C-alpha cells in the first residue's frame, strides 16, 4: 500500500542511501508497475550522476546494486522482449555521460551463459569495442569463448557470427589495455576449434609470429594456446608454421620460467599427432 509513497519519497530525498533504498525496495517487492518506472526513473538519474559528477566507492557500489536491481526486474516482470529497449540505455551511458562495461556487460554475460545468438549480437559488439573499460572487454571476449564449446560449428565461427566477432578482434589488437591481448589471442584457438575451415588463418597466424616475440609470459601462455586450438581445430592445414613454433618453443626452454610449460607441451603434443615428422625438429 505505501510503495508507490516511498519510493517518491525517496525520490526527492535523491545521502547515496536514497538510492540505495529505492533499489533496496524494488528489489525487495510483491509494485510491478511502479517497480518498472522507478527503475527507469533510477537509471536515468544514475546517468546524470555519473555524467556531470562521475564517492568512487559508493557510486561503484551503487552501479554493481543496480545490475543486480536490472537482473532480479528483468527475470520477475522474456528477455527477448525487453532487449530492445535494454540496449537503448545502455547506448545512453556511453562517454556523454561508469555502468556499461563492468556491470552491463556481466549481466549480459550472465544472460549468454543458438536461438538468442541473433540478438545478441550486437550487444557483444558493444562489448569487444568498449576497451577504458578493460574488464567489460575482457568479460566479452571471454563470453566468445564460451560462444565456441557451446555453439561450435553453429558458433559460426566457420560460420556467420564469426566474420563480425573475428574482425572486432582483430581491430582490438591494432588499436587498449595490453592485458585484453592475450585473452584476444587465446579465443581466437577457440574460434578456430569451432569453425575448423573458416579463412583468418593467414592474419592470425602472422599475429601470433609477432607476438611470439615476448609481453611476458602471460603472452606467451595465450599464444601456444591459440597454436593448438589452431591445430586441432582444423585437423587441418597449418604445416609450414610448425618450423616457427618448435623454434619458439625453443627460446622459451632456455627462459626458465613455468605456466607457459604446461601450455608449450601441450602444443608439442598435438603436433606429433598431426604432424607426424616433427620429430626431426624437435632432435
Given at each position: 500500500?505505501?510503495?508507490?509513497?516511498?519510493?517518491?519519497?525517496?525520490?526527492?530525498?535523491?545521502?547515496?542511501?536514497?538510492?540505495?533504498?529505492?533499489?533496496?525496495?524494488?528489489?525487495?517487492?510483491?509494485?510491478?508497475?511502479?517497480?518498472?518506472?522507478?527503475?527507469?526513473?533510477?537509471?536515468?538519474?544514475?546517468?546524470?550522476?555519473?555524467?556531470?559528477?562521475?564517492?568512487?566507492?559508493?557510486?561503484?557500489?551503487?552501479?554493481?546494486?543496480?545490475?543486480?536491481?536490472?537482473?532480479?526486474?528483468?527475470?520477475?516482470?522474456?528477455?527477448?522482449?525487453?532487449?530492445?529497449?535494454?540496449?537503448?540505455?545502455?547506448?545512453?551511458?556511453?562517454?556523454?555521460?561508469?555502468?556499461?562495461?563492468?556491470?552491463?556487460?556481466?549481466?549480459?554475460?550472465?544472460?549468454?551463459?543458438?536461438?538468442?545468438?541473433?540478438?545478441?549480437?550486437?550487444?557483444?559488439?558493444?562489448?569487444?569495442?568498449?576497451?577504458?573499460?578493460?574488464?567489460?572487454?575482457?568479460?566479452?571476449?571471454?563470453?566468445?569463448?564460451?560462444?565456441?564449446?557451446?555453439?561450435?560449428?553453429?558458433?559460426?565461427?566457420?560460420?556467420?557470427?564469426?566474420?563480425?566477432?573475428?574482425?572486432?578482434?582483430?581491430?582490438?589488437?591494432?588499436?587498449?589495455?595490453?592485458?585484453?591481448?592475450?585473452?584476444?589471442?587465446?579465443?581466437?584457438?577457440?574460434?578456430?576449434?569451432?569453425?575448423?575451415?573458416?579463412?583468418?588463418?593467414?592474419?592470425?597466424?602472422?599475429?601470433?609470429?609477432?607476438?611470439?616475440?615476448?609481453?611476458?609470459?602471460?603472452?606467451?601462455?595465450?599464444?601456444?594456446?591459440?597454436?593448438?586450438?589452431?591445430?586441432?581445430?582444423?585437423?587441418?592445414?597449418?604445416?609450414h608454421l610448425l618450423p616457427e613454433m618448435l623454434p619458439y618453443i625453443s627460446e622459451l626452454q632456455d627462459d626458465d620460467d613455468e605456466v607457459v610449460e604446461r601450455e608449450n607441451r601441450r602444443w608439442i603434443v598435438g603436433i606429433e599427432e598431426?604432424?607426424?615428422?616433427?620429430?626431426?625438429?624437435?632432435?
Open positions: 500500500v505505501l510503495y508507490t509513497g516511498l519510493h517518491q519519497n525517496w525520490a526527492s530525498a535523491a545521502i547515496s542511501e536514497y538510492l540505495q533504498i529505492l533499489g533496496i525496495a524494488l528489489d525487495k517487492h510483491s509494485v510491478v508497475k511502479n517497480v518498472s518506472s522507478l527503475s527507469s526513473i533510477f537509471l536515468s538519474a544514475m546517468d546524470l550522476r555519473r555524467t556531470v559528477a562521475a564517492s568512487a566507492m559508493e557510486l561503484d557500489e551503487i552501479e554493481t546494486k543496480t545490475h543486480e536491481d536490472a537482473l532480479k526486474m528483468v527475470y520477475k516482470l522474456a528477455f527477448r522482449p525487453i532487449f530492445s529497449k535494454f540496449v537503448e540505455w545502455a547506448t545512453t551511458g556511453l562517454p556523454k555521460s561508469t555502468y556499461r562495461l563492468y556491470v552491463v556487460f556481466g549481466f549480459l554475460d550472465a544472460f549468454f551463459g543458438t536461438g538468442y545468438a541473433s540478438y545478441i549480437v550486437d550487444a557483444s559488439v558493444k562489448a569487444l569495442k568498449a576497451v577504458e573499460e578493460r574488464n567489460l572487454w575482457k568479460r566479452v571476449l571471454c563470453t566468445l569463448a564460451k560462444c565456441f564449446e557451446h555453439d561450435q560449428d553453429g558458433f559460426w565461427q566457420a560460420p556467420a557470427h564469426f566474420g563480425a566477432v573475428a574482425p572486432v578482434l582483430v581491430e582490438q589488437f591494432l588499436r587498449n589495455v595490453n592485458d585484453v591481448i592475450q585473452d584476444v589471442v587465446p579465443a581466437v584457438v577457440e574460434l578456430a576449434a569451432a569453425v575448423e575451415s573458416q579463412e583468418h588463418y593467414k592474419e592470425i597466424n602472422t599475429a601470433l609470429l609477432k607476438h611470439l616475440r615476448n609481453g611476458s609470459p602471460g603472452v606467451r601462455l595465450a599464444v601456444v594456446k591459440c597454436q593448438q586450438a589452431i591445430t586441432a581445430k582444423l585437423g587441418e592445414d597449418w604445416l598431426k604432424l607426424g615428422e616433427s620429430l626431426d625438429s624437435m632432435l
